[PDB]
């Protein structure tokens, strides 16, 4: 499995991102301090993920470049720009660790409950974000896809930032209203917040890192990735209910924290007067009593079978998305990934 | 005066600003939702200030461009380039004010604090982040300085964040430590934190948009420019305290707030064992019988003094700094500046 393989090689590289990103402190000793703590920063939220959006990156570069062209340069900055996506999302999950107040990433405490650090995550999260710019320049500032893939980077923030924006539009932090919990609505969510940088900003920047420049074909790949994307986060929502949770390494926590889940959506989509008022009770409590009451709803209204005919219909159209969009580009670019999606 | 001139049509030009960041809404009305509120944190916060960083770009701009090479569009492009500075601020401001738990900012009440906003100012900062790389795509991606504009706004973002750790690093939410209160680690803060972004920034904008692209008048145009920084955050300290609030539009803080004040710097510089115990008490209290203690420490040790020969030698310094470094440039562009930033 092309992924498992090359997760070493891409791990032992953070040790490298991390000395180049701390060897300016050596021509000016003065920001020592604030780069001892970049360090720390980095060091505990980059690292502890699957590295899987980072991953995409490498798999796709080594499908897109002939193995000729794949000199031991080339690698090191293909790992660099899979690391350069690791910190994007490091970046906002620091802020948005901050922002809906969590207490736990990746069974870790979130940096920003860390004793010391608090609010100054915030400019913590800044400085991950930073990091990017950074190694695109010290990597990749002689080849012609350097504003590329800063330009990439950008657009993908911008678009991610915009997800946000629009999700704490939908689900305020003390506000409980269903009425704007749309499948119209979920979908933009899901675009802008999830799909954009988790599945087109991947293999763009390998399609850019390996000369695949032209408008079209991104518009091809981006067609498909944001599907997928799309797939992934109703998959997500889906196995944080129902899925056993020894695989998937999640407890159920969207009912309680009155997050716009597919599942919602659905039930919403699909409810009598009557079945909306019992849900509009129970949905946001933390209360057992509660949210095992919502869990009883969901499965009166078959959506565990919803979901079984939306997975079915969705592999069918993201092949047939592959077969129509995939052209000039390997189809293994997107039937790897689809691959990891898919069950 | 050039700036007072130019203060009109540059905030005539933020209604275009505004009209084209909400434009992908027209073709997306999906996002519509975030792109309106985008509209509300841009009209919150970028506006309200002086504008003196985004009017710098402008009046750099004029200076360095010959009038007949100042048509339209370069103008369209020079006021936006300004808007960036301007936008780079406000993602600093907004970001600064939650960090620091503050209360008001230019006498309104910070964006954070508003109902409804709280944390959610941090993605609000971060999408005033976005528009920068947005307007530079929007007014200046057919330009030759297009890179040169991005990679400034990215590496003075990065030495801002920087000098934000360096700063709370040195002075803790919750810790009174005046050890680590030295020059050298305030001249740092000063030249991360604000010198960069502040004076050398709109000036570097500018002289990019020039086709003043070398190295050497770039790092030219920073040795003057960090220097300027130095002395305005020495002033600004300054007037904090000591400062008629009227003519300033300020109240004394940074001793309650417990900041690395160049004041405190310079206490700590010269006293006795027993007069460092006086200040290490009533440094960093909020009731006005300490706050009062510590301005008579200072008055005391003559600080007032110590400032009126810092302003004489600092003065004699930038000009020296200025004949030796400002060729090829005009002269004008930093006495322009310098003569705002003294007296
Ligand atoms: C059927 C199924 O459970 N699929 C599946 C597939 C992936 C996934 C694999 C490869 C590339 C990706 C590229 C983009 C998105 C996802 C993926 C996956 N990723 C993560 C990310 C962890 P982190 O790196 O945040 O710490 C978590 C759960 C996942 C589940
Ligand atoms: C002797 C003296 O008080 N000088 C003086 C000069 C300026 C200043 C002028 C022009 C360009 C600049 C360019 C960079 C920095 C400062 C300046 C100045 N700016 C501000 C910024 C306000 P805002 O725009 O944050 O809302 C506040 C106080 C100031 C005082």
């Not at 979920?186 to 408008?215: H, N």
């Amino acid at each position: 499995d092309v992924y498992a393989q090359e997760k070493q090689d891409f791990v032992q590289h953070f040790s490298q991102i991390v000395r180049v990103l701390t060897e300016d402190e050596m021509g000016h000793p003065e920001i020592g301090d604030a780069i001892a703590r970049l360090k720390e920063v980095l060091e505990y939220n980059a690292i502890g993920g699957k590295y899987n959006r980072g991953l995409t990156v490498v798999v796709a570069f080594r499908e897109l470049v002939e193995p000729r062209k794949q000199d031991a340069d080339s690698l090191q900055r293909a790992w660099t720009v899979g690391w350069c996506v690791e910190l994007l999302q490091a970046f906002f999950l620091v802020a948005d660790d901050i922002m809906d107040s969590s207490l736990t990433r990746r069974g870790q405490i979130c940096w920003y409950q860390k004793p010391g650090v608090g609010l100054d995550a915030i400019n913590d999260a800044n400085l991950l974000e930073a990091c990017i710019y950074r190694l695109l320049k010290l990597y990749c500032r002689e080849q012609p896809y350097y504003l590329n893939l800063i330009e990439l980077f950008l657009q993908s923030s911008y678009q991610t930032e915009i997800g946000q924006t629009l999700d704490l539009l939908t689900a305020p932090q003390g506000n409980v209203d269903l009425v704007r919990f749309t499948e119209k609505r979920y979908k933009s969510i899901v675009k802008y917040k999830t799909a954009f940088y988790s599945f087109y900003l991947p293999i763009a920047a390998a399609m850019y890192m390996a000369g695949i420049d032209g408008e079209k074909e991104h518009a091809n790949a981006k067609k498909i990735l944001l599907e997928m994307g799309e797939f992934f986060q109703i998959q997500d929502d889906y196995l944080d209910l129902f899925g056993d949770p020894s695989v998937t390494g999640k407890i159920g926590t969207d009912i309680q924290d009155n997050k716009c889940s597919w599942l919602v959506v659905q039930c919403l989509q699909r409810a009598t007067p009557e079945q909306y008022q019992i849900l509009k009770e129970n949905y946001g409590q933390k209360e057992a009593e509660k949210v095992a009451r919502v869990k009883a709803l969901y499965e009166e209204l078959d959506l565990p079978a919803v979901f079984l005919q939306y997975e079915e219909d969705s592999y069918s159209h993201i092949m047939a998305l592959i077969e129509q969009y995939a052209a000039p580009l390997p189809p293994a670019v997107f039937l790897g990934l689809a691959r990891k999606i898919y069950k």
